């Protein structure tokens, strides 16, 4: 119902190309090892300094609506590349700008831009096939460190710390990046089953040196129902007193009467007991409770289906741990005495639960439960003297982790934009159906030189001469823009994930070739 | 979604440098002993006069958003220096402006500002290592008075009063600054356990000369629960009457029945009794009650875990004090007869509780409880004729206290900016990795002369000649800008905390070297 | 977060001096016996005509924020002088303007304004010491009348009425200024225990000539609790009827049953009784009832602590008065037959209560209770034909009362600004530490001539010649600007309180010397 403005043909295409050019010129200064940073003002406080392509892209909107349409389309390119791969958003931005510009230049009266888009997609399919042909899998942790170092803008310490984390918790393990209160980055490996619930009562502390409660070779009593009655807690204390062993009671809550009995026995006579709240807020809480019961070799009390009551507890019904530590904010369990076959059965049940999940929030919970069962988690705390530096380094650490995961799952190719440079003869071996498909193939062929040219241009040298020298060299030889020399890319460690490269190319081409099919642009009249 | 303005390169860098220069020029007039003050207009009332760098920094925002970005970044520098150290914010501001200016001057086509930032950080690490090498610990109260005098803009009385406070309550004791109703500053030492709760009933006054209640060698009855029944108070009164000794009932509250019994026994027959509310509003109330019971050698009645009732009071169960003073707004306990070993055990329990605490509010409560247990607290009341003078002097007193604590924990170096001046040959003994790292090292080397130059410039002399005369002199010789003479800085008392200097340098460098890496600035279009 | 404007140095200082000069020029026309008045527009109603310096100062705000900062600082000077002394705000304003102007003129590149402020404070301390040296105590009521006459702009009737009030109720008694419906001012002395509560029932009138209840030698029944039941009031009526004496019942309230019994006995059989609500609204009500019980020799029934009951009343328990007057809006008790020792004990208890309070509202209640127990209160009703004249005269009456109290508590010095003129040789005896302290001492030395110059300037003569003639004359000789001659100021009654002069000088100097230390002024952008 709102009044609209309508533009036709070359003027509208030039306006959207101006928007695409502005956004891509802002993004492209951050590309490569000699790329610079972008400062974006934030309304609520300190500005954000970033080297991330999708962060620069998503922070740009234009007053002109025709320019803003192209800006939003390249924003879609960068956001899709960030969601699919987690890296390569600047490459996707410059590839999309190149495809849009070369497609806008090729539109005439007799041209058919839809068939040009068809040829573009055929050429991109050929290039992706060649990229999959020339890729090799990751076999050594040195390649992991090299990938994480290249993806973190040459930071060797970030790559080394990611390699150490992947050595400790596994290449498919859980690694989480967070802030740090120190100047330097640190890696913390959390082993066993550690959850975010401390002790209910502060009188359970038997080690005042760290304000924590520690036991060795303790019984574990697991329950989903809240323990409140005297009769629900006396028999477990009777087993723990008869066998002279400590007892940790993990439950949803411990109410007043049961906690009064526990604190009275802890203080007056010296009973080794500690109460712990059950982590989770629903079905995840019961799933985690079952995981600790399986790991400790105990059964869960207050089951909704099995109906196990706390008034008849057996010594075999209690789990066992070699070590437990409970603090103010967290509790952890070490060396559970559970049966290994049941632990493995729960592990593959979690794995089969991971096969069918699309919410991308239950997937993280299942991965966390698998890590707590198998090998623990890794926490990367990013150091810095201020919040802006911490955020700037955290973006690079997240990029390096995403690229390391992509390289683990799909392999590596040559870095520096040389992987796309070696797929040009695959396009030279193509037979187009007509003239418009040939135009699209030539558009993709000219676009394939763009990332290496941008990386060389950001280093202060002429990118066309560098690209020609790379193409005239052997397949293993590329350009190192840090040292500024022509080297062996694999031996020098300049490598890229295959998934990142193909994702950036496909996501750029799909939106840019559709943008180049436009004849009429309809916008709203600015009020 | 809002429309944005995008600027590239030298114009955006010049605008950010204009904002940084404006804020730093406003801050830099307050530096040194000949620095002046800044008047900031307050909307709600009287303007604020200050000599504090972070106060001037946080009070400046610019209508130009490109200038405001640099202003916010140097605001972050000043605020981080204030949060980590509590002093040295003007030095951090001028160092950050110098690093930003010299890094903006050094950007060209072939320059790599990220490697320049790497060299800046390496040079700052070398300078911090040299500062820790040249630092010496504080060993005498004369050095404490000298540090507090230098940090309070040459006020000898503030330094003397801080030295007296640190002599009385300890160098790690609790000292609190507040306003004063008198012209002159005063120091009040609160010894023993004094809390903010007065008597419940005004009929408990036995000393009408000061409208207060005083007893000597009194029993103490401490209750975690509110005393409400008559039967909960008859046995304690019976013990106090049989032993003929005063009773101080520290409880959560006293209801109508127990209070009427207390006033009736006070007035009709002459029972020496007084009732006082338990200080605190939660877990801290029970913690303070436990510390009072441990110091007085008694037990807390109505315990949530131990379940001690007030109907079974014993003479050994009651605590003892040598003197208790009860005032309308406060009550205090002197010479508790508690066991020294249990008091020491509670003291190290509080100390170990202090080791694991990051909330920075429980830390203050634990420090206050430790001070009430060990050595009391100190209160500095700042004098003046108006609120603006009191606030202006209170800023300097807070600065002097922060610098004194920093000098206690980390030692002292030469004042007047000479400590950074003596770390230049440590940078001269550095081998850069490449040209950009060499550029960053030279940036830090030129920046290291800035604080002494600013201090000398604020004194009306040429700072470059003064700086050159300092470097041509011995390592113990610096410039006194008050006398305007070249002196021995340790013998004249012109010294600085090492922590303040390294904090200011690191916080300036970390943000300014990241600001100098910028190529594109994105701001919001002003509505 | 709001956008700010920042000004540096001489331009900012000139704008602040423009604001200070505007507000001080408006204030200074009201100074001395030949000062004029200022009309301030009020939004709600009629404009206000005043000769008060703090009233003129607080009513001025400027659109220019740089000028408004200086205006607010001189407002702070005037308000601090008004709150500390109650008089001398015009003198403080002109002294502050002089110190600000002389400090602004003396700022150069080599000047240190903080040391100038230190020298200003040292000189002001020397002048205050000389003022305390030359002060004389007040010994005669003629000096009281002279002080109150000078402070009331030469009004001899106001001074005489204040001297009469201080003669009747004491020099430290309670005197309250209020409006008058008559053309002329009047002084009313309220003796005994008069409070703002009338009788509960209009049937208690036994003297309809003034619509009042009139009894001689009456029993008094004082109750802290409400009297509602029949049996709560029958025994007291039985003692009153048996001894054949009138009964005034001062209680919190009287409910329907007891009131109906009282009115039935008053109308039918002719019982001399009257019921009166207890004055106060809380703890002050109980305190006032206790003072009435002590003064009348009775006891308070329904006390919360002692728990006295109205069902067992003894003839000695009731208080006695020689005369009680009950009026529709107020009730008074005369010739209480209480024990003199207990009255004195209550008086010293109230006196000791006054030394441990700072709320300034409980102090008024304590002083009112002490006046009702010892000497009564005085009410000055200010006459006039309109509200504007009544307010204008009430400001001068309040000024004269404040100056009379200050002269009682601290003594008197020479008026007309001659007391500050005689302190100049004390500054001539000073030895400055450096050049900036010498500058500050010279600033204060030139400032000391300002009040006499302003008083002579308002009289229409050249103030510099007058000040030179005063300084060349004897120490007892000053300038009567009212008569325009040179006289003995003590013999002519032209005297000032020492407290007012030293308060005005200290309050002016403390703010103005801090204002002259500024280099940067930060204001908000006017929206
Ligand atoms: N020393 C180097 N020499 C040559 N090329 C390099 C070097 N280091 C990195 N590269 C290449 O530079 C590219 C990395 O650029 P950059 O990480 O800034 O952008 P991106 O991966 O496209 O996107 P994002 O901004 O999301 O990280 C990769 O192609 C990588 O192979
Ligand atoms: N008499 C003096 N001679 C030379 N240098 C001095 C003298 N007194 C102090 N200084 C130096 O001046 C500096 C103190 O400046 P100032 O306290 O105004 O600023 P700051 O500490 O950087 O910041 P903040 O505004 O937060 O206090 C220190 O480097 C100190 O060593
Ligand atoms: N006849 C007189 N001859 C000379 N000086 C006089 C005479 N009468 C009063 N003065 C002086 O004039 C001053 C009184 O001025 P004024 O009361 O207007 O101002 P103030 O006390 O500074 O302030 P405020 O406006 O609060 O009253 C005093 O210094 C007093 O000694
Ligand atoms: K990038
Ligand atoms: K400063
Ligand atoms: K006046
Ligand atoms: Mg990357
Ligand atoms: Mg300081
Ligand atoms: Mg006056």
Curated annotation (Swiss-Prot), chains A, B, C:
Modification N6-succinyllysine, positions: 7, 58, 101, 109, 167, 178, 181, 194, 212, 226, 277, 328, 372, 457
SUPFAM superfamilies, alphabetized: GroEL apical domain-like, GroEL equatorial domain-like, GroEL-intermediate domain like
Pfam family, one: Cpn60_TCP1
Annotated ATP binding sites: 51, 87-91, 416, 496
Cross-referenced PANTHER family: 60 KDA HEAT SHOCK PROTEIN, MITOCHONDRIAL
Positions of post-translational N6-acetyllysine modification: 51, 58, 63, 67, 101, 106, 109, 132, 167, 178, 181, 194, 212, 225-226, 245, 268, 290, 328, 335, 365, 372, 445, 457
Gene: HSPD1
Source organism per UniProt: Homo sapiens
Subunit: Homoheptamer arranged in a ring structure. The functional units of these chaperonins consist of heptameric rings of the large subunit Hsp60, which function as a back-to-back double ring. Interacts with 2 heptameric Hsp10 rings to form the symmetrical football complex. Interacts with HRAS. Interacts with ATAD3A. Interacts with ETFBKMT and EEF1AKMT3. Interacts with MFHAS1.
EC code: 5.6.1.7
Position(s), cross-link Glycyl lysine isopeptide (Lys-Gly) (interchain with G-Cter in SUMO2): 527
Classification lineage: Eukaryota, Metazoa, Chordata, Craniata, Vertebrata
Gene Ontology cellular component terms for the protein in this record: cell surface; clathrin-coated pit; coated vesicle; cytoplasm; cytosol; early endosome; extracellular exosome; extracellular space
Name listed for the protein in its UniProt record: 60 kDa heat shock protein, mitochondrial
Source domain of life: Eukaryota
GO terms assigned for molecular function: apolipoprotein A-I binding; apolipoprotein binding; ATP binding; ATP hydrolysis activity; ATP-dependent protein folding chaperone; cysteine-type endopeptidase activator activity; DNA replication origin binding; double-stranded RNA binding
């Amino acid at each position: 119902g709102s009044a609209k403005d309508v533009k036709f043909g070359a003027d509208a295409r030039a306006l959207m190309l101006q928007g695409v050019d502005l956004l891509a010129d802002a993004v492209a200064v951050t590309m490569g090892p000699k790329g610079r940073t972008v400062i974006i003002e934030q309304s609520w406080g300190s500005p954000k300094v970033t080297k991330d392509g999708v962060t620069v892209a998503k922070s740009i909107d234009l007053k002109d609506k025709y320019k803003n349409i192209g800006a939003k389309l390249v924003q879609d390119v960068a956001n899709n590349t960030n969601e699919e791969a987690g890296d390569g958003t600047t490459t996707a931005t410059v590839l999309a700008r190149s495809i849009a510009k070369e497609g806008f230049e090729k539109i005439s009266k007799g041209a058919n831009p839809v068939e040009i888009r068809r040829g573009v997609m055929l050429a991109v399919d050929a290039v992706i096939a060649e990229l999959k042909k020339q890729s090799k899998p990751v076999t050594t942790p040195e390649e992991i460190a090299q990938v994480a170092t290249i993806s973190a803008n040459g930071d060797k310490e970030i790559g080394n710390i990611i390699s150490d984390a992947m050595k400790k918790v596994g290449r498919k393990g859980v690694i989480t990046v967070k802030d740090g209160k120190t100047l330097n980055d640190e890696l913390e490996i959390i082993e066993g089953m550690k959850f975010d619930r401390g002790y209910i009562s502060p009188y359970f502390i038997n080690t005042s040196k760290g304000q924590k409660c520690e036991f060795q070779d303790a019984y574990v009593l697991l329950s989903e129902k809240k323990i409140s009655s005297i009769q629900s807690i006396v028999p477990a204390l009777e087993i723990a007193n008869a066998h002279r062993k400590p007892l940790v009671i993990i439950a949803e809550d411990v109410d007043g009467e049961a906690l009064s009995t526990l604190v009275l026995n802890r203080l007056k006579v010296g009973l080794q007991v500690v109460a712990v709240k059950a982590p989770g807020f629903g079905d995840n809480r019961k799933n985690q409770l079952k995981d600790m019961a399986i790991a400790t070799g105990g059964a869960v009390f207050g089951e909704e289906g099995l109906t196990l009551n706390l008034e008849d507890v057996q010594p075999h019904d209690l789990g066992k741990v070699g070590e437990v530590i409970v603090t103010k904010d967290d509790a952890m369990l070490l060396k559970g005495k559970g049966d290994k076959a049941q632990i493995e059965k729960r592990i593959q049940e979690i794995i089969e639960q991971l096969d069918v999940t699309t919410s991308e929030y239950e997937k993280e919970k299942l991965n966390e439960r698998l890590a707590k069962l198998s090998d623990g988690v890794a926490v990367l705390k990013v150091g810095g003297t201020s919040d802006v530096e911490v955020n700037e380094k955290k973006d690079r650490v997240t990029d390096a982790l995403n690229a390391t995961r992509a390289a683990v799952e799909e392999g590596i190719v040559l870095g520096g934009g040389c992987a796309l440079l070696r797929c040009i003869p695959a396009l030279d071996s193509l037979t187009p159906a007509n003239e418009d498909q040939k135009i699209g193939i030539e558009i993709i062929k000219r676009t394939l030189k763009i990332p290496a040219m941008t990386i060389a241009k950001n280093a202060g040298v002429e990118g066309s001469l560098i690209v020609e020298k790379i193409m005239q060299s052997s397949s293993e030889v590329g350009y190192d823009a840090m040292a500024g020399d022509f080297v062996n890319m694999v031996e020098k460690g300049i490598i890229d994930p295959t998934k990142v490269v193909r994702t950036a190319l496909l996501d750029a081409a799909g939106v840019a070739s559709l943008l180049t099919t436009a004849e009429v642009v309809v916008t709203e009249i600015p009020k």
